[PDB]
Design a protein around this nucleic acid. Structure first.
Ligand SMILES: [Zn+2]
Lengths: 375, 116, 333, 111, 225
RNA sequence: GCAGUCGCGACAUUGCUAUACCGAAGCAGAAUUCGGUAACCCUACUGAUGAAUGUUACCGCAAUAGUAAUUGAACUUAGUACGAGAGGAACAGUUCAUUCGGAUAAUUGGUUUUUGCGGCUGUCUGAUCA
């Protein structure tokens, strides 16, 4: 399924849904006649609830079936057990459904209303989760994914904003983003998607990025700083990198860096990592790193032309082709051609230099009389 | 606009009259009237039918080939729209038509051997 | 059917009458609001389609048109209508005094026995120094500013057996009703031709009485948004000619129209099939509202007009074609 | 063609006859949904869209001519006009040719 | 060099237009962008005749001619022939052809020196094409394809053919034509390259839906740069 | 429904048992949802005659009664705003298609008592046209 959901049915509060159903059933209207009318009224009520519950179930994706990464992300954003309990409650609500006839109809209507009201908490949770799940990032694991990771935003968000047009916050405060930010682009006629990490130092924000990196095939770029930026110490950054190495080294790792030289170069112990020194504001090394990252994923009777062409540099109203079609002179450009004469097409008896043909008449006219046809 | 010669009769037919038949062979089976169309469908071959120019010319009832008819060629190329050509065609077409009309009676008289 | 066209009672008269007139402006010059004619059959036309943005733009199209004989229409009087809290009232009517035998026959139901004394004493008021007509005209000038002119057709010119003329009221769109009445004074007893009012490609509406089918049919009906294709006149040589075919032939087909005479006089060719059968009198109003649609604003260039015989199935277009194709015949030799 | 009728086909695909199940009456260039019985499993027993290329009934083209074709034939294609057949036998009407460029492109003879 | 255009939100450039080294032909339409693109790409270089053939919008599939001559189909009316003669200069010959299979645009694919013709073509028509256009007669069916005029597009610098063309057939045809040939899709997988695009010695026109790999392949084969 | 929490005990409370036009919803676009304007019988039916307006006729007005047009498709504006991408508006003017209504037979056509033509047949004339 496409990783962008907007058809998920909206979840209204329990009271609002009950009122809507009651109004709809009220609008869509002897002993046997009374009983039949009351039974029809009772029947028409639960159909709406069943249809709405089925639509909600269909719209809401299954957490444990779509993908392991999607399951992990859904669990991190919202309690997975709570979501499953809400789905189970929705299923249970869907599956549960003169004077005596009126009392029975009231009993059925009130039972449905009470079920809906008790469903308010699961409905409230469903609405809240729907209001955030729909516009979730359109991550495609099967595509060519490049991940940007590291400590909080040092300015590396600018690199992603430049490689892909997807605008991303680049404010340098403690934690820029709180979710995955993805941006598509093209390289060598091949589609690529760059995903940014809000920051790795647990917290759900960092856990989401860690799970995405672990469960999604990608080529990863870890960011560090040699200058005063990023706040955190180079030693702390190196320790975090080493601690994360066991489950992250195999992800096509590159290093971008915005006794100091020895400490920074000591990170070269990892075999497959290539380190590049650049900055968030320069252009030369930024473009070099962009090209290197783009290449890393893949690494892991002669013709006749008129001379005038080379010199060239660049329905409410009808348009006339006069002055567009060519003739010997502009004065007689009008199409006064009759094209029909005495029931015979002009072209059927129109030829050039027909004056010579006209000469034959001088003898053909005499042939009318002197040939013996009539006289 | 174009006036088409009837396949069954060779007479002129104007747009908006009759019905044309388009066979799988993609040929213009145009006819002046439903009578001619149905005759063609029934295969009342015009060359064997008395009342068609196709039979008349072949059998000599009317002039078969003449200068007045040879000039009616289906030209493969157009002309550059010269007024002198239009004037000459206007001058010549009426005289050619009159000559052909007279030669029709001439051929009738020639065929009339025995009573002429 | 639609309730608007009910009840299904027979039309009051064969000569349908216009029930509404175009809005008038007090600044534009004098101009007639409507004309009349007789439907002299129908024909087929082929013309180019220069309409832009059309699926068949710049291509050729074929359609059916109705021909209406519209001989010169001669004025006989003018009437003033005063507005009141009870509608319009005919305040005064003044006639040209030159009433023809046709209008006399129209007024007399059994003319063949009538003494033909109509309009004899009234002629005295005009056949002298008068000034009564001048007084009436001044009365009209001071009074109501809406004026209608009575006219009748030259039925004798039209090839019809009725022989009786018909009276019709036409409004004038000229401002300063003093000018309207002054123009009527100079045009009294005069005949107006077709080309005076209408123009080519103009959008109009028509009113007539439909053919009866046995009650079935025989009701007054109006068809709106009809485009005028041609306005031919008897003095105009080759009324049936066009720019392309330019054949020197009249719109009258081989053998003339079926159930109608061979029209050789003024006529109008318009889009569509105006209601009414052959020999039926129809009226043409000039677009009570000035529609600015591209359909109305577009012009038409006639390519060719069908002239083959209508009775039966046309074999040729003009008499010259049949004998030319035949060559010779026992009927000739 | 009347609704629900059985007609022939003119495409060079693995289908020879069509049986209308829905219409989107019928005429030249009209699109219908139909199944195939005379043919091969590639198209037989499955519903597919078809476009009529011949009418067999007289009609007045806007160009000013009354014409009619010989036999009623169609061509199988998707709703967007992606005709499977690389070629079409027999003539194809101008109305359908202008409406479906692919049909005109793959048509051996037009009008 | 390669320009992307559309007609009525369609990529059937080869159906709605035709191009040659000395002139271009386009169909009737209300969209001014279609004419503007051709004017910008060619402008004063060559005339752009805005006209129909036989009153159809498939002028692209109806026309069949080169810079040397134009062999219009049978359906071309006398008025259309006269208009084409007026629009085109006397340097380009124009002639009508009487054919039972007169869909010339699809039947015949030709360039300034060679004319690929569907074997269904008649000997008289092939000889007329060779004489008027001064091109060789190439009775060929590219990898079994029937409509060469629709499934191929030949320029003097290179040729484009449908993707299913066999390597051996491509090599043989390229050797015969003395110019390179490449098999590739157009308009995002459209196999009818002739109907989907047109090309000449210096200009290539494709649909707005052409993918980047298809555009790159087209540019590489035609070597416009 | 029963029970309970709050001298009779008001709302809360817990246990089981079609389209079009508006404001909004986290309305990026499209699409979607919510609340409103709400879509052999009486009277008969209809066509039509009709004692009397000083006579007939023409031109007319209108009190009153009926009323209608509806749905869909393409261009422009658009592959533009919008949008990580997939996808994708609308207004302004044009060009078309279906249902319904009012009219026509210029062409075509289902259909003939041109009660028209020529051949044939039934039958039958001085035998043979018929
Ligand atoms: Zn005939």
């Amino acid at each position: 399924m496409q990783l962008s959901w907007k058809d998920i049915p909206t979840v209204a509060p329990a009271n609002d849904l009950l009122d809507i159903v009651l109004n709809r059933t009220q609008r869509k209207t002897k002993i046997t006649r009374i009983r039949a009318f009351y039974m029809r009224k009772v029947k028409y009520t639960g159909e709406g609830f069943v249809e709405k519950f089925e639509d909600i179930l269909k719209g809401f994706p299954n957490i444990n079936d779509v993908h392991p990464f999607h399951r992990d992300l859904m669990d991190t954003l919202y309690e997975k057990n709570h979501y499953k309990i809400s789905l189970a409650a929705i299923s249970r609500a869907k599956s549960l459904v003169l004077f005596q006839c009126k009392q029975l109809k009231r009993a059925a209507l009130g039972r449905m209303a009470t079920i809906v009201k008790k469903l308010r908490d699961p409905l409230a949770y469903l609405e809240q989760v729907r209001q955030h799940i729909g516009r979730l990032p359109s991550i495609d694991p099967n595509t060519r994914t490049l991940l940007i990771c590291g400590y909080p935003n040092v300015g590396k968000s600018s690199f992603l904003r430049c490689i892909t047009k997807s605008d991303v916050d680049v404010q340098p405060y403690a934690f820029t983003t709180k979710s995955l930010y993805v941006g598509h682009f093209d390289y060598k006629y091949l589609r690529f998607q760059a995903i940014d990490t809000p920051g790795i130092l647990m917290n759900n924000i960092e856990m989401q990025s860690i799970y995405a990196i672990a469960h999604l095939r990608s080529c990863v770029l870890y960011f560090m700083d040699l200058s005063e930026q990023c706040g955190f110490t180079i030693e702390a950054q190196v320790k975090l990198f080493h601690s994360i190495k066991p489950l992250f080294a195999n992800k096509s790792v590159m290093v971008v860096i915005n006794e100091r030289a020895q400490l920074l170069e000591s990170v070269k112990e990892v075999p497959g990592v290539e380190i590049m020194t650049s900055s968030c504001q320069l252009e030369e090394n930024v473009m070099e790193v962009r090209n290197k990252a783009c290449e890393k994923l893949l690494a892991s009777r002669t013709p006749f032309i008129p001379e005038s062409v080379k010199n060239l540099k660049k329905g409410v109203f009808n348009v006339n082709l006069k002055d567009k079609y060519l003739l010997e002179d502009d004065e007689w450009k009008n199409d006064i051609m009759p094209e029909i004469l005495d029931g015979k097409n002009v072209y059927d008896f129109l030829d050039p230099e027909i004056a010579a043909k006209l000469q034959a008449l001088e003898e053909e006219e005499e042939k009318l009389e002197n040939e013996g046809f009539y006289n | 606009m174009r006036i088409y010669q009837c396949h069954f009769c060779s007479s002129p037919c104007y747009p908006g009259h009759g019905i044309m038949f388009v066979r799988n062979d993609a040929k213009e089976f145009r006819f002046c009237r439903s009578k001619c169309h149905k005759a063609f469908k029934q295969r009342r071959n015009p060359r064997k039918l008395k009342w068609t120019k196709a039979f008349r010319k072949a059998a000599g009832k009317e002039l078969a080939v003449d200068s007045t008819l040879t000039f009616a060629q289906r030209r493969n190329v157009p002309v550059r729209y010269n007024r002198e050509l239009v004037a000459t065609t206007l001058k010549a077409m009426a005289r050619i038509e009159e000559i052909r009309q007279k030669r029709e009676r001439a051929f009738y008289k020639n065929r009339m051997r025995g009573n002429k | 059917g639609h309730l608007g066209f009910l009840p299904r009672k027979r039309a009051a008269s064969i000569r349908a009458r216009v029930k509404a007139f175009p809005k008038d402006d007090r600044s534009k010059p004098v101009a007639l609001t409507s004309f009349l004619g007789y439907k002299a059959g129908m024909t087929t036309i082929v013309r180019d389609l220069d309409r832009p943005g059309s699926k068949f733009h710049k291509r050729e199209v074929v359609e059916a048109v109705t021909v209406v004989d519209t001989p010169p229409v001669v004025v006989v009087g003018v009437v003033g209508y005063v507005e009141t809290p009870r509608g319009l009232r005919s305040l005064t009517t003044v006639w040209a005094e030159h009433l023809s035998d046709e209008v006399k026959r129209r007024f007399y139901k059994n003319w063949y026995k009538s003494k033909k004394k109509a309009f004899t004493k009234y002629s005295a008021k005009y056949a002298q120094d008068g000034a009564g007509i001048e007084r009436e005209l001044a009365r009209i000038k001071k009074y109501a500013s809406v004026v209608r002119v009575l006219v009748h057709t030259q039925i004798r010119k039209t090839p019809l057996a009725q022989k009786k003329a018909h009276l019709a009221e036409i409004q004038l769109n000229g401002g300063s009703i003093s000018e309207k009445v002054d123009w009527a004074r100079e045009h009294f007893e005069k005949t107006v031709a077709v080309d005076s009012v209408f123009e080519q490609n103009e959008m109009i509406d028509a009113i007539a009485v439909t053919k009866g089918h046995g009650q079935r049919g025989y009701h007054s009906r109006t068809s709106i948004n009809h485009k005028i294709y041609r306005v031919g006149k008897g003095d105009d040589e080759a009324n049936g000619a066009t720019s392309f075919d330019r054949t020197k032939k009249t719109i009258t087909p081989m053998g003339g129209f079926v159930h109608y005479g061979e029209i050789k006089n003024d006529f109008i060719m318009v889009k569509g099939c105006i209601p009414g059968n052959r020999k039926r009198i129809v009226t043409l109003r000039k677009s009570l509202y000035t529609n600015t649609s591209r359909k109305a604003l577009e012009e038409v260039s006639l390519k060719w007009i069908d002239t083959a015989s209508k009775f039966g199935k046309g074999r040729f277009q003009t008499p010259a074609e049949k004998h030319a194709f035949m060559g010779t015949l026992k009927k000739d030799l | 063609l009347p609704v629900g009728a059985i007609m022939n086909c003119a495409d060079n695909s693995g289908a020879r006859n069509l049986y209308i199940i829905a219409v989107k009456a019928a005429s030249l260039g009209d699109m219908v949904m139909a199944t195939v019985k005379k043919g091969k499993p590639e198209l037989r027993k499955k519903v597919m869209p078809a476009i009529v290329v011949r009418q067999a009934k007289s009609w007045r083209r806007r160009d000013g001519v009354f014409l009619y074709f010989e036999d009623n034939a169609g061509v199988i294609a998707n709703p967007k006009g992606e005709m499977k057949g690389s070629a079409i036998t027999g003539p194809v009407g101008k109305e359908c040719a202008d409406l479906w460029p692919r049909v005109a492109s793959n048509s051996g003879v037009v009008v | 060099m390669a320009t992307r255009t559309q007609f009525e939100n369609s990529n059937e450039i080869g159906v709605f237009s035709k191009l040659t080294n000395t002139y271009c032909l386009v169909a009737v339409g209300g969209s001014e962008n279609f004419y503007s693109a051709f004017e910008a790409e060619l402008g004063d270089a060559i005339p752009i005749v805005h006209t129909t053939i036989a009153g159809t919008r498939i002028i692209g599939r109806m026309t069949a001619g080169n810079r040397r001559g134009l062999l219009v189909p049978t359906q071309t009316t006398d008025q259309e022939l006269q208009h084409l003669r007026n629009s085109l200069p006397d340097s380009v010959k124009i002639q009508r052809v009487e054919e039972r299979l007169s869909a010339l645009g699809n039947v015949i694919c030709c360039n300034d020196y060679v004319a690929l013709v569907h074997p269904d073509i008649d000997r008289e028509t092939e000889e007329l094409i060779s004489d008027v256009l001064g091109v060789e007669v190439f009775r060929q069916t590219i990898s079994g394809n029937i409509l060469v005029g629709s499934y191929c597009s030949l320029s003097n610098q290179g040729g484009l053919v449908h993707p299913q063309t066999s390597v051996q057939d491509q090599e043989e045809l390229s050797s015969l034509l003395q110019v390179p040939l490449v098999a590739g899709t157009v308009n995002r997988g459209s196999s009818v390259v002739g109907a989907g695009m047109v090309v000449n010695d210096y200009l290539a026109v494709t649909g707005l839906d052409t993918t980047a790999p298809e555009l790159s392949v087209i540019e590489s084969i035609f070597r416009l740069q």
